[PDB]
Amino acid sequence: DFTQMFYNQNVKQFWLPEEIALNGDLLTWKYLGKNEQDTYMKVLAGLTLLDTEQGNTGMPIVAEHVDGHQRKAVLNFMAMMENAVHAKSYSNIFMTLAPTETINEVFEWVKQNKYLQKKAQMIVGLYKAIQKDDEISLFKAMVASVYLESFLFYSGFYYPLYFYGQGKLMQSGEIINLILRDEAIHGVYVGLLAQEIYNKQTEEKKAELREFAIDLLNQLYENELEYTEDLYDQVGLSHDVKKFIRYNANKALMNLGFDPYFEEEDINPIVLNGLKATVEPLKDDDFYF
């Protein structure tokens, strides 16, 4: 009942980072403190890693196991967006704002950062555990994918949105909003596929799947807290970002058909403001009038 409308929405949302000129951010970037620039680079690098794996691994593997040519076409399109559009856009931003050495250093930093490695290990592990014709392993990977789309990106998205909302780094911010618009529909779509599998189960099996989903969310959440503190303490925003990730965790649960898990909190209003011609042959009657 939904794939065709998602197909149409995904293809109509198609974009490339080159559509957005980035040289306009040069001055507002220059004006940020060293702490702010550091957090910003690292935040986008963490996002780049997530999209790299979502494009290389997550979306293609889910596409492989989901039945139906139209469902596969949507998932293939989403996969392309992840690595050919989203992951690449971050390099466009980096290449504009930062010198090569700072770019090299931040990519080295992703490799050695323990929270980023842990979250990649956990998410990609679940993708690679999918067994052919085994719907339960597929469900588990789809939960992981929804958590990546609708929860994990948001510790990263906070900062570009926070600046956009203050009228700073607005070209980079425009790119990020386009990425976010895509991930929102990706999270909903994968959520609907996960619910399909969940709804086939016995009540006992469903109870176990909810346990899996909640245990996984809590494990990812605890890691994300440490990641958030590590990045945002130097810019004074860790508590604010934490509220934002809890907000989005609830959206991820809802995408999976589950009740919200965290209590509602006031999000920084700045971040809320951040959101040939046709040919016919000649008939013999066309020669007479």
């Binding site: 040939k276 011609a277 046709t278 040919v279 016919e280 042959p281 000649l282 008939k283 013999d284 066309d286 020669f287 007479y288 009038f289």
Partner: protein, 683 residues
Amino acid sequence: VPKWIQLNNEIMIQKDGKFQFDKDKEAVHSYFVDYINQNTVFFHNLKEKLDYLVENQYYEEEFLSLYSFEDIKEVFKTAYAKKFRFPSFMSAFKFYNDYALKTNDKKKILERYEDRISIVALFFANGDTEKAKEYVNLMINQEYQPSTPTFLNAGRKRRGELVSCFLLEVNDSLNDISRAIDISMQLSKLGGGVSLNLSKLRAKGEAIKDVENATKGVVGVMKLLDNAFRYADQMGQRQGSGAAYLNIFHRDINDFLDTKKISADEDVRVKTLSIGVVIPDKFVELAREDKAAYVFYPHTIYKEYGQHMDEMDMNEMYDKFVDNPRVKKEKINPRKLLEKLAMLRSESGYPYIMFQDNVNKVHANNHISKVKFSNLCSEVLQASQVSSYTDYDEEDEIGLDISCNLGSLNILNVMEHKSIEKTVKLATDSLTHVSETTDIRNAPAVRRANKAMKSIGLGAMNLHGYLAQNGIAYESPEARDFANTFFMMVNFYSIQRSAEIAKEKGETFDQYEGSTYATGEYFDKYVSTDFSPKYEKIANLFEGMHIPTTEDWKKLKAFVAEHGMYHSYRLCIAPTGSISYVQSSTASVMPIMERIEERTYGNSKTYYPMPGLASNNWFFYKEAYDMDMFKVVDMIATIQQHIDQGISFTLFLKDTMTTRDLNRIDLYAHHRGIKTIYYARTK
């Protein structure tokens, strides 16, 4: 943004659900209060102005020396006594950006509208102060408009030629091809559009000095001509414009057409060379009956019969060509060729279509030659004789190359002044003067044909404007009735003026005695059919003007028999591109493309409503694309029955209609007697 531009863009801003057309008038005032008067060079008296313009090599001394200064001052005073005001901003903008004389630094305005009109009138009169005042009254009433070359360059020392339509015949030889390239370059240097007939050129794969498969065909000649026209581009001012015409029975016709396909390679496609196709009635008959046609190798026909393929009547020669074993030919499908023509016209508007038999069944000078091709605008249709340009130190055989003299009547201004006769006769006199004062020293056949034929083209414009401001739909039978009557009167007075000039000067055009004017055949349909309006509204439109009857046409026929006719050709309806703006008129006899046109000049936007457009006549100003092309064809044929040459007839198509619809329009034009089809503009 300048104030006049804001006042012009305020037109689109709708007040009470209506366009602010009157605001345009205010814009004109601003354009004159803020810009034109500030940048217009003023002199203490006209004597100082004329001395400054002559001394600084702006004007010519010869034409001003024919008058005393008192006569020139009187002509200028007559021009300024009208107190002419441009009714729309675009009229004044186009005049002062394209035609008004500017200093060498292009920052000051030396000529006003009245100054330019007075200078052109003094040039026209050639020493007659009263005739100059008559011309000034004609042009300041905007009844007649000399073409862009004549209007822009008359009386100016730094100028191109006053003729910009040139038709060249190219003979089948390397010497003739090189001479054609040279003449095309020289005429583009003069600022003229050059049309070349390539039908006499032998096709690709023909023999040169009895060696086989040697000729490159007409496509190599087209490449040479395209390079020549790119090189000669009016001293780097306008893009060099040229046209090539090929008969549809020439074998290269496909490759010819292939020069306009987008998929064509760089060694095949010509970009600055327009193409036109000449379609005899035989091709239309073959396509109609679905019989497979034959495209012939011209050199084999020339060897067998001693005459070029395009020099003989294909209707009686096609069967003999097909049955002749010594004539080489290739099988084609005429319906496929018609579909290819329609597809190419849909893609790019090319080629121009010339219906050879439609032109030649009413051609008055078939004895001199049959009309084999048209001009760059596909409205000049005249007899031409090819020239034999031999080797060096050998006398060339100079033929006739067509170069007619353009000038357009403003139908609205002419008819509201009830001065069809006076305007037509004065325009004919001015065109005769410009033809006589044209001397091209690098085009021998053009000069010879200008001296001999004395052919002029008197066109008309503002037909749709006049009809819309009079509550007449362009597609209505009343509009066709008006066009019939008006252009029959135009033809009558043009013939009368030509015969009067022949009687006064004692000379006719060369080979007039063999023309249908001399034999009286031309007047047949005029001495038997009455062209008075059949509708009361059109008759009331013509009130106050004598409409020539059959007896008047008989008297004119007798007068032509006794005295002859000075001009071989008199009437041709040119597109009238930019002069229609200055005259505040719709272009040519074509229907308007848009009611209000949006243009971008510099970094500014401007809005030109069609002349006289208002809420009352908004519906009568129907756009050309919304119109039925069959009724447009009917109107153009109604006009063409009174025009000796052709009419620049652009088809206006919607993106929805297919190539079948385009072919149907072309075939209905052929059926209705349309001589030429200019363009297929798709909306």
